[PDB]
């Protein structure tokens, strides 16, 4: 995009393309999960009004993180797991300044980290179907 | 300012941390069992420097990058080896090549895609072998 780092979609290239952008802020992150990763819902501030996206399949159970104020994404770590036929994210977690946070989800596969020495996590990206085929992030300091 | 992501493996050996280079040149990995470790050759506010990062050991393979050719990808394997906690694979990938990886100890893996942006630069930690290795991320 315009000036943006963009890193990995991680995971299968069957579903749909989901992109949100870069955020001004995220406000919460929902990872919905069961056996895989069902889906990822996010809450963002853009262009200074409140904007939800609904990423990934509907299915599973919710586990929410709310960024406080100073609370910053700064890692992101799963599992690339083979599910049914598809490969999916059968594992995802998250880290921000404060806590971990998962991870969600019982599938075991090839596993992937992103520790974010500096900068943050600003954005998500990647690919949706009945479940979350893959997942990216912008980054930004 | 910068962007920087991982530092993938162990806590042994010394830090290193080349910070962000203007281009990167050449890449160089040496690798036996697993990854001895790397040579950069880069530009730097009108200078050519070279630095090189972990032990003596492995035989060289040199990534040269070519006109508009950018680093897109990052990934090898974490491995304990004999004791120590070092990258065991290693490899690159340019937006017009895959490369390596290199070393032949696998364990635990890693992948770094860049799906917009390049990397510009090198961190991490370094011994006898690579320790742990990370990126500068730049767009
Ligand atoms: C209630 C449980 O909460 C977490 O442990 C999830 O990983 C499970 O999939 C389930 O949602
Ligand atoms: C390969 C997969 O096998 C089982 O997991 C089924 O329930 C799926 O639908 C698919 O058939
Ligand atoms: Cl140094
Ligand atoms: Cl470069
Ligand atoms: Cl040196
Ligand atoms: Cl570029
Ligand atoms: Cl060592």
């Given at each position: 995009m315009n000036g943006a780092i963009k890193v990995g979609a991680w995971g299968?290239?069957?579903?749909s393309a989901f992109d949100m952008g870069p955020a001004y802020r995220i406000i919460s992150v929902k990872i919905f999960s069961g056996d895989v990763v069902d889906g990822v819902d996010v809450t963002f501030t853009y262009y200074g009004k409140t904007e939800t996206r609904h990423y990934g399949g509907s299915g599973g159970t919710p586990h929410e993180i709310v960024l406080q104020?100073?609370?910053?994404?700064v890692g992101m770590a799963g599992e690339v797991a083979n599910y049914h036929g598809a490969v999916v994210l059968g594992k995802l977690g998250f880290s921000t300044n404060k806590k971990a946070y998962g991870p969600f989800g019982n599938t075991g596969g090839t596993p992937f980290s992103l520790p974010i020495a500096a900068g943050k996590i600003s954005g998500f990206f990647g690919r949706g179907g009945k479940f979350l085929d893959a997942i990216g992030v912008y980054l930004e300091p």
């Open positions: 299968g290239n069957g579903g104020e100073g609370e910053y994404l």
